[PDB]
């Protein structure tokens, strides 16, 4: 993996490996999502990095408020998939991560995502809002001209929404993160919550559909010794609600829709 | 990746991804015993298998994890390259045995090693059966005709009798259920999630002040996708050495049994 030409966004390769695939021969979600995170973890690292010099002495973080995943084609074990990711500034708001997912043998588009990410005090976890002086260590390793991976106005990436109403259709509750869903910061992964959202999908769904889209909110942190409750009702191409809860209290920790799309 | 020369072993290098890793900041032992699935998922394709033969596909016969032992010298950290070296080796009628050599790609030490004891199996009766003499003339042309022990000592740790872990258990991990990322493609529960799952029931207090060495881990029944699983650890001793048990929070039913050696750091 290499920084492009101009140094405003940076790519990899990735060969799917036997214990990345589902029951269909092709790559999961969740390893699409892990190899996402992987790229943006080196694209980081390639630039000086994703806490800035600022940023490390306040105790502020990166934290992410929404993913959105669109995939077309799931590269099969043994495929070469590459992957070309870039931060772009949102202003007072926060920064935005794209990227595209391509088929290294065709050099065709075979999905894209988009991420928000907001500022935040790590120990207290506040808000604050992007900051002067921090907002422009980082500016200079973002393209100046917008660069959208869904560029399309008025598009899925930025619908709201809502709240799953009780009953759910579909639960899947008593669900722990274990040793292996937690980083190097002993922090559940991202990418954990997402295999929560579609533990509550049904098995015959799954079975004759494919996940072609994906957004999904983060509005709370589940701990290492949390308790989580995964919620589905049928909202319809198969679309759903999701919502992913503490056991306990019911707290919100996640919050999303998934499509899907007929074999 | 690619064979050997003689094509009697395979050898791949992996770089350690930031997901691998753990508080350490090194390559956790369930990303380890991955990239050791990996590299033998590959050494079975690169010869022509699916690991089963023309014959065994043709009875309904599978390759099963029987043991699995993993001693690692040195965890790779997230960015360094990790060289492993695979080869099956025939042991008679009893079935296979896999081994592993884990390097370093910069300096060419050894920083771990694996090795598994596979046995046969009717995929649907699940009855295990002694290997036959045609279907060990078709895997033995891939195979050292001289023997290649990873672990070679005449006292090695990975030909060890496990007991089974008495109650009460000093530790416990209680309704361990597995997901679909910790599925297969055929649905089955992976075998390194039995590692994760053995490993939850040590304390979190020696996880942070200890480094896992040794690891051996023998395979008596498969959990389903819709079972449910507890964790039992037990403190059988610088050095900590525990017993574990994998069993069906229900009625009981043994799924797994090991031990684990951890270090000072
Ligand atoms: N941001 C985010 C959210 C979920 C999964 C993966 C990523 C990449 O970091
Ligand atoms: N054999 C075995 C056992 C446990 C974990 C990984 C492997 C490799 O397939």
């Given at each position: 993996?290499?920084?492009?030409?101009?140094?405003?966004?940076?790519?990899?390769?990735?060969?799917?490996?036997?214990?990345?695939?589902?029951?269909?021969?092709?790559?999961?979600?969740?390893?699409?999502?892990?190899?996402?995170?992987?790229?943006?973890?080196?694209?980081?690292?390639?630039?000086?990095?994703?806490?800035?010099?600022?940023?490390?002495?306040?105790?502020?973080?990166?934290?992410?408020?929404?993913?959105?995943?669109?995939?077309?084609?799931?590269?099969?074990?043994?495929?070469?998939?590459?992957?070309?990711?870039?931060?772009?500034?949102?202003?007072?708001?926060?920064?935005?991560?794209?990227?595209?997912?391509?088929?290294?043998?065709?050099?065709?588009?075979?999905?894209?995502?988009?991420?928000?990410?907001?500022?935040?005090?790590?120990?207290?976890?506040?808000?604050?809002?992007?900051?002067?002086?921090?907002?422009?260590?980082?500016?200079?390793?973002?393209?100046?001209?917008?660069?959208?991976?869904?560029?399309?106005?008025?598009?899925?990436?930025?619908?709201?929404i809502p709240k799953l109403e009780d009953p759910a259709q579909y639960s899947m509750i008593?669900?722990?993160?274990?040793?292996?869903?937690?980083?190097?910061?002993?922090?559940?992964?991202?990418?954990?919550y997402?295999?929560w959202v579609?533990?509550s999908?049904?098995?015959?769904?799954?079975?004759?559909?494919?996940?072609?889209?994906?957004?999904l909110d983060?509005r709370?942190?589940?701990?290492?010794?949390?308790?989580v409750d995964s919620l589905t009702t049928?909202?319809?191409?198969?679309?759903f609600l999701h919502l992913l809860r503490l056991?306990?209290?019911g707290q919100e920790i996640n919050r999303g829709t998934?499509?899907?799309?007929?074999?």
């Open positions: 993996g290499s920084l492009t030409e101009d140094g405003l966004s940076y790519k990899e390769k990735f060969v799917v490996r036997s214990y990345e695939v589902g029951s269909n021969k092709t790559a999961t979600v969740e390893t699409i999502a892990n190899l996402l995170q992987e790229v943006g973890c080196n694209h980081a690292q390639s630039v000086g990095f994703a806490t800035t010099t600022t940023m490390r002495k306040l105790h502020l973080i990166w934290v992410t408020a929404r993913m959105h995943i669109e995939i077309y084609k799931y590269p099969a074990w043994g495929d070469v998939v590459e992957i070309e990711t870039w931060c772009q500034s949102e202003g007072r708001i926060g920064t935005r991560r794209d990227w595209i997912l391509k088929d290294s043998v065709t050099g065709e588009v075979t999905g894209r995502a988009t991420s928000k990410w907001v500022m935040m005090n790590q120990d207290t976890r506040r808000l604050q809002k992007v900051s002067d002086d921090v907002r422009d260590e980082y500016l200079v390793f973002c393209p100046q001209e917008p660069r959208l991976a869904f560029p399309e106005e008025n598009n899925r990436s930025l619908k709201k008593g669900l722990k993160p274990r040793r292996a869903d937690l980083d190097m910061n002993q922090h559940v992964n991202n990418v954990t997402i295999g579609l533990e999908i049904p098995q015959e769904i799954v079975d004759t559909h494919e996940l072609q889209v994906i957004t983060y709370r942190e589940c701990q290492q010794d949390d308790v049928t909202t319809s191409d198969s679309q056991s306990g209290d998934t499509l899907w799309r007929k074999k």
